Design a protein around this ligand. Structure first.
Ligand SMILES: [Ca+2]
Length: 352
């Protein structure tokens, strides 16, 4: 019921007393959440009055298709997103098949929120934090079976030459336990941070069974804490992958890396290098780099790359229960389980 296969343990809105609602538009989602804060007497209840299961049936393909055709006109528009602020009764936002959104989900100071089967893409407002999914000061969040996409490209003359599009899954603050699973993330320059700054360290996050394709960096950009990445398929990484910083620890197991530049590294700070424990990935030694097109580059400040493909530290005993399939099975099967319209199907060895 509360098993996500990672550090997050939540059933979201699928609990006792849950109220099911259908949202046909972004504004409905907003109105529905607002109504869920009132008690039988019409007075607001801190954290929400009752649990919710919102089924989003909206479709914004027209907005998405128009944006895909004019990539550079997106960054300067107003950002669009539904905010889930201080809602702790339990909430699940699940898209209907055929559903789509050109707006993001921004979670702040909440807990026990699950967002599933949502196809989100080409969001406007990259220069004003137009994230697809943001988890801020929010423990027990599960982002599962979603398709997050844009174009892995940077337009000219954008603020900081970094704002053509914002991130897919940014995690920051006290979001102590989070699970990011079965997502199909493609065409994204900045996938997601795990800590917004050098001081924003900590958290225990699990990234499992995600399919990354044509992404530039931040898988994630980790600042301290623990990150467990297993059964992910990493292909066409154009910049860097898992960047473990501020003495963070990562357990990188049974993943498949292919056509990736700097898949596992610790760079951009020049100090306080993170560590990684590598085991069961398709790459087992430097000899495999050529086999899978793994390239390494240096940085202008002191850095550490896993070009020796050896463990550089340790990792505490993994709390939860999980059963990873082989890296080969991920490569062969994952694409059919990750994303939307897969009916939240999970990959087990039985299917390998
Ligand atoms: Ca952001």
């Amino acid at each position: 019921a509360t098993d996500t296969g990672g550090y997050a343990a939540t059933a979201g809105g699928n609990v006792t007393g849950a109220v099911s609602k259908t949202a046909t538009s972004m504004q409905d989602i907003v109105n529905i959440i607002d109504a869920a804060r009132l008690d039988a007497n019409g007075k607001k209840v801190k954290g929400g009055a009752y649990p919710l299961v919102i089924t989003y049936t909206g479709n914004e393909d027209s907005l998405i298709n128009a944006a895909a055709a004019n990539i550079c006109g997106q960054w300067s528009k107003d950002p669009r997103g539904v905010e889930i602020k201080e809602f702790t009764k339990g909430i699940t936002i699940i898209g209907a098949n055929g559903s789509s959104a050109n707006f993001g989900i921004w979670i702040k100071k909440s807990s026990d929120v699950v967002v599933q089967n949502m196809r989100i893409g080409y969001l406007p407002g990259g220069a004003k934090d137009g994230d697809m999914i943001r988890v801020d000061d929010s423990p027990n969040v599960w982002v599962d079976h979603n398709e997050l996409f844009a174009a892995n490209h940077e337009c000219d003359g954008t603020p900081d030459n970094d704002t053509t599009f914002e991130s897919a899954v940014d995690i920051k603050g006290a979001s102590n336990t989070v699970t990011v699973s079965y997502n199909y993330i493609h065409g994204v320059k900045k996938v997601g941070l795990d800590g917004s700054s050098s001081s924003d360290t900590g958290r225990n996050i699990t990234y499992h069974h995600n399919y990354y394709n044509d992404v530039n960096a931040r898988l994630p950009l980790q600042r301290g804490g623990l990150v467990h990445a297993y059964n992910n398929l990493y292909t066409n990484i154009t910049g860097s992958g898992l960047n473990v910083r501020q003495n963070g620890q990562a357990l990188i197991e049974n993943n498949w890396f292919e056509k990736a530049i700097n898949p596992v590294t610790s760079r951009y700070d020049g100090k306080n290098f993170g560590t990684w424990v590598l085991k069961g990935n398709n790459i087992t030694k430097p000899a495999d780099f050529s086999t899978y097109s793994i390239t390494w580059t240096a940085d202008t400040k002191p850095y550490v790359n896993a070009d020796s493909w050896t463990s550089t530290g340790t990792f505490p005993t993994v709390a939860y229960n999980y059963s990873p399939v082989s890296a080969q099975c991920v490569k062969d099967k994952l694409p059919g389980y990750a994303g939307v319209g897969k009916n939240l199907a999970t990959l087990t060895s039985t299917a390998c």
